[model samples]
Target: MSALPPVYSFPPLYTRQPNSLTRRQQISTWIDIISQYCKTKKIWYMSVDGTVINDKNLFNNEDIQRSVSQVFIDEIWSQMTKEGKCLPIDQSGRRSTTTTRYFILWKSLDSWASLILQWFEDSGKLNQVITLYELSDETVNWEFHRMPESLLYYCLKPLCDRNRATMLKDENDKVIAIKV
Candidate 1:
């Protein structure tokens, strides 16, 4: 179809991204697209950037080949910084101490909030007692940038303020939700 718009016949897509917001959007788009690509292709694992990313895997003679480098990874995390999406779910993403990578959902906080509310409604546990940990891990737990408990509390706060729900902790060290 019109010569496929001259794909990465050369090699410039591997470079670091500029512009924080735009780069974030780009990274998000890539994460979304590549996530689906990985799922469809049944590609579960990716090597550490410094180890496996190369021009060959980045460009394809037949299929789409998107190369992500260490710099690219940093840039994606940087965007998470700007959006306040970065959370200490795990320890490795916070520092470059390990080659192990982190994953993101690439969705916004509001979307996460909506999801939690829906989750609360679905289990008929709405306005009932629920663990903060369970709430965070139920649906798209892998995408979260924060701790399970903290993120759940953050999402729940707005609901509480809006008078849609009530959040409380008991002396017995349990959290409860009462929907209104």
Candidate 2:
């Protein structure tokens, strides 16, 4: 929720640093910036192609009058992925030189699952059949509100894996209900 660091306003940061050590530090700073920015904005994913989603794009720093080059963005994102802070949704999944998109995991799936389960217990919804829509409804005033259903299922997978929750599905195999 805070503004980017003052170093981010430095023009040199928009360009790749030549020194390996400096580059590494720069990349780490960018990773922190991207992670915090996405978490604060409730952004689930970022397009490497630089398309704006949810009115925010990490590559663009309008306030600083700077935009990181695609090469720099790719490098920073790759570093973030290696650190387990992001997922590159590319086919190879190797150091993505051409990745088009990435999912930001400010909190890991397991953490998300535990949080959701705790919410169920606190709200007295445990053991009660609840629709996927209701679980992610913004009206519930939950931090996870408006979460994408696919990601929610991913978060729920751990609970189901541990036999702490059950997912009921339709004939089409789409999850329709969850019980904790």
Candidate 3:
């Protein structure tokens, strides 16, 4: 993890700055913090409305004893999804006050797909059927290890989209294989 900026530990950062320039900087800083933290923690999803679907530590700063307000966090989610930094899992493809989930994209899908493909080539798994379990398993020792299955499919979709790979599913619609 990179060294966080000094302003990150400041409690006033939880409050939206009044000046436009300062507010923009503040929000950018928040986005950076969230992105880096999620990547480091291997957090794939987070509830937009302050519900802790997977990890709650994201919202709370123990050192400062300050947690970011839900309204402000929602605004940050809206901004990040708008900028294509994260994917809102809302049915409408837009975040709302009631949004319950989000898919964090510290790296874009295309980028992840390329990395997966490279892994296949490097590990001699190319042209072989690889299970979803293998892709998401912790022991894989790959850069993408421990990725959520749903998020892994999203990462692999670009390859399928371009006919560079194919997805194999069982009768129950569960993903069973990937031929890359």
Candidate 4:
């Protein structure tokens, strides 16, 4: 069997990207790439910039040859964050600063809920364990209060109505989800 060629590189990925649709496709490519990287091993923690470039945290970077502005990083991070594909790891590492290194979560709460429900049906773990918390994190369910509530509610309510997921308080006293 022959080997497949490399599909995409970030720098050139945006070279010809034009509209929001193309931009989203590019962002989606990055998500797939990062998720594959996250799942192959127990990548519990990593610096955000460390995943993309050879520089340090995209700041304190003096290698002028390849320029990666802060805005670019933010845009990429926004895509991951909104999709619940990744989140910022609090600055508690060796380089301890107020930096927000991203934690790439391959699964979203909605999808996780579906998987749990399927597993419950298949493996018969449903209502057997108080899936109030420990099964997964729920922070992704709620949005920041400062965000545009109207727009977010538009998407969230449908999820609730579909019975694909639900918001509830579990044994851990943490707000959680239950997918049906």
Q: Which candidate tops TM-score?
A: 3
- Estimate TM-scores for all models: 0.44, 0.82, 0.85, 0.43
Model 1 whole-model lDDT (C-alpha atoms): 0.47
Model 4 residue pairs with clashes: none
Please, what are the lDDT tens digits per residue for candidate 4 over residues 58-153? 222333334334565566777777777765545432222554565555655455435445544665544443233433233222222122222222
Candidate 2 per-residue lDDT over residues 1-116, each given as its tens digit: 56456776787788889888999998898888777777877776677755535626656777878888888877887788889888665432323566667767788878889888
Weakest ten-residue segment in model 3 by summed lDDT: 90-99
Q: What is the descending TM-score order? A: 3, 2, 1, 4
Best to worst by lDDT, what's the order? 3, 2, 1, 4
Q: In terms of TM-score, how similar is model 4 to the real structure?
A: 0.43
Report residue 152 deviation for candidate 1 (angstroms). Answer: 3.5
Query: Model 1, residue 66: what's the lDDT?
Result: 48
Candidate 1 on 12-71: residue-level lDDT in tens? 444445777666566665444434543333232233341222111321323434455666
Candidate 3 residue-wise lDDT, 84-166, digit = tens: 88877664333554556887788998999999988889888889998877886653666678776767888888999888999
lDDT of 2 at 168: 94
User: Listing every candidate in turn, what is its Cα RMSD in Å to the true structure after a full C-alpha superposition?
Assistant: 8.5, 3.4, 2.9, 10.4
- Model 4: which ten-residue window has the lowest total lDDT? 142-151
